[PDB]
Each structure stands twice: as structure tokens, then as C-alpha cells.
Ligand code: HEM
């Protein structure tokens with residue numbers, strides 16, 4: 001079962017509303033006026049250089065960031081070239097990357113929403129057509145549409161009445177979300 | 181002006197760069213050689229900017245260091261442009277070290293093209309000169325590199341070219357010697 005944690009800041013928001021906000025902020029700091037862009041520029045694979053238990057990336061337009069967690073691998077120039085594949089267990093979205101290999105992994109300074117126990121598994125054989133690829137490739141430019149479709153399918157698997165249009169409080173009522 | 185360093189006394193610039201891109205193209209090019217290279221790569225300290233950009237090869241270990249103030253734009257317009265201060269193209273064979281060591285350095289530094297004065301703005305994009313240099317060398321193609329060296333040693337000496345011996349440039353006060361091991 002997908003498990004979701006969300007800050008109380010978004011208690012009344014739909015999933016699809018929050019992802020639109022995070023994507024807007026990724027594209028433009030002025031989507032959240034008041035914020036300074038000063039996150040120490042880190043990110044990459046942990047441990048890397050091309051495989052890890054996490055892949056993390058922060059916008060350069062803002063300190064919006066994401067952390068993909070699982071068992072991930074990237075092919076570079078090897079056939080299926082430029083494919084991200086493996087197991088995608090979770091996607092955490094928020095503000096500013098901290099940590100890295102030497103602290104036990106990347107974390108977010110402000111973790112806003114986190115989607116976990118995802119069970120996504122894409123094999124190398126599907127190349128860049130794989131789901132894990134599409135999800136994390138979208139997020140690298142702040143495009144949360146591939147992630148959004150996947151959160152939808154997984155919620156409907158828990159309950160065909162839950163969707164990216166359910167608010168986090170409703171998902172919490174459903175036993176799927178947990179407020180933080 | 182330019183400064184090179186160099187086993188490579190009789191070689192021309194076009195000669196050494198023909199062999200390296202060959203060994204970068206595959207390990208077949210330098211028979212005897214094997215590959216154990218601890219699979220590095222990246223910006224120092226990165227993710228997308230650094231004082232060095234080291235990149236090992238996949239087929240062999242022929243590998244280059246880019247030295248200076250370098251930047252990669254990713255999705256920032258102009259997208260997927262590497263630009264910045266390209267002050268040296270090291271060109272050794274193995275690309276050891278790291279960011280958390282003191283900088284990248286090849287264990288067998290072969291030829292350091294060392295003061296190139298290449299400086300490209302971001303506004304130029306993929307048409308910039310520092311891009312076409314470093315991206316060429318991403319895959320072996322050292323044509324763009326050689327062209328900029330050709331126009332650089334010609335300001336010091338018009339009769340001198342890239343098809344000239346390595347000692348010819350060192351005897352004129354442009355390069356010195358770095359041994360073998
Ligand atoms: C983290 C370290 C990474 C490095 C060093 C890297 C490097 C590169 C380079 C150098 C290219 C252009 C190569 C060329 O066309 O000559 C490229 C292309 C590409 N990369 Fe990566 N990449 C990385 C991570 C990723 C990740 C995580 C993804 C996907 C989630 C990704 C997806 C792609 C895609 C889709 C292309 C386009 C290839 C094409 O259009 O032919 N990259 N990458």
C-alpha cells in the first residue's frame with residue numbers, strides 16, 4: 001500500500017493541488033514569495049556516481065527539491081542508454097537538500113509531502129519507457145505529471161474512490177496519509 | 181600565451197591527439213593496456229559546476245580533466261550548455277583522485293594544454309567554444325580541441341603549427357618536460 005506523509009501546512013489540499021504548487025515553485029521561487037534561493041547546491045546519486053539508494057536534485061530556480069528512494073541505477077551511455085531504472089520505493093518533495101553520502105543520505109530541510117511504500121519496479125529492459133524513468137526524469141525539470149499519474153493509480157489500488165483529487169485529510173481518514 | 185607539457189618529444193600535436201581519441205574510442209588502440217579505472221566522472225564538487233570536470237571512458241581509461249571555472253546549465257536556457265573558464269585540458273591516462281582529496285589528477289598525465297584562455301559566456305549556448313571543446317572530448321572527438329590549439333600557438337609563432345614536433349614548441353619557450361612511469 002502506498003503510504004503518504006504530509007505537513008499540516010497542506011492538510012486541506014488535494015494531492016494534485018500540492019504537486020502543482022511544488023512544480024510551480026520548482027520553476028519559479030516567486031511562486032512562494034518570501035523565499036530566498038540559498039540552498040547549498042548538492043544532489044546526485046547516493047552513493048553514486050551512477051547508482052544508489054537515493055537520487056536527489058534541487059532546482060536552480062528555487063530551493064524546491066526532491067529525493068527518490070529505492071534501489072536505483074542509471075546507464076549513461078550503456079545500452080538502454082540514459083535510462084534510470086530499478087526499484088522506486090519513495091518520492092519525498094520539499095525545500096532544500098541537506099546531507100549526502102557522508103551523513104547517511106540526503107534529507108530535505110523542509111519535507112512537505114512524501115509518497116512511500118510505492119512498490120514501483122522498472123527493469124533495465126524497458127529502457128527509458130520504464131515508469132521509474134518517466135517519474136524521476138519528469139521531476140528533474142520540476143514536471144510532476146508522471147509522478148502524479150502514478151500516485152493516482154496507486155491510490156485507486158487502495159480504494160477505487162481515492163484519487164489525486166482527494167485532500168490529504170481525506171487520505172488520512174482513509175488510513176493512507178499521515179499528518180506531519 | 182599557451183603552455184603545453186609533455187615520451188612525447190618527437191610528436192606533433194595532431195599526432196598525440198590522434199592516439200588519445202583512438203584509445204578513448206576503444207582500448208584496442210593501445211595494445212597491452214588493460215582497464216581497472218575506479219569508475220569516476222563528474223564535476224568537482226558538482227552537481228553541475230566545479231573547478232574540475234573529470235570523465236573516465238567506458239571502453240578504456242583514456243580520460244581528461246577540464247580545469248578552471250566550469251558550469252553546466254541542464255534545463256536552464258540555453259539548455260544543456262557547458263560553459264565557463266576553460267583554462268586547461270589535462271589529458272593523462274587514468275583520472276584518479278577526487279573532490280574530497282584536493283582535486284582531480286591523472287596518475288599518468290600525458291599532455292597538459294595548460295593556459296588556453298578559452299572563456300565562453302552562457303549567452304552563446306551550445307555554439308560556445310568551451311562547450312564544443314569539452315563535449316567533443318566527452319566522446320573522443322578532439323577536433324574542436326586541436327583547432328583552438330592551432331590558432332593559439334600561431335600567435336606566438338606564425339610558422340609554428342599543430343603539425344609541429346613537441347620539442348619545437350618547447351625549444352621556443354612554450355612547453356617543458358614531464359617524464360614517464
Ligand atoms: C546523475 C548523473 C547524470 C549524468 C552525469 C548524466 C549525463 C548525461 C549526458 C552527458 C547526456 C548527454 C549525452 C549526449 O547526448 O552526448 C545525458 C542525456 C540524458 N540523460 Fe543523463 N545524466 C545523469 C542523470 C540522469 C538521470 C537521473 C536521468 C533520468 C531520470 C537522465 C536522463 C537523461 C536523458 C533522457 C537524456 C537524453 C538522451 C538522449 O536524448 O539521447 N540522466 N545525460
Ligand code: HEM
Nearest residue numbers: 140222223227228233252254260261262311314315316318
Ligand atoms: C553533470 C550531470 C548531468 C546531468 C544530470 C545531465 C542530464 C541531462 C538530461 C536529463 C538531458 C536530456 C534532457 C531532455 O531529455 O530534455 C541531457 C541532455 C544533454 N546533455 Fe546533459 N547531463 C549532465 C552532464 C552533461 C555534460 C557534462 C554535458 C556536456 C559536456 C552534457 C551535455 C548534454 C547535451 C549536449 C544534451 C543534449 C543532446 C541533444 O539534445 O541531442 N550533459 N542531459
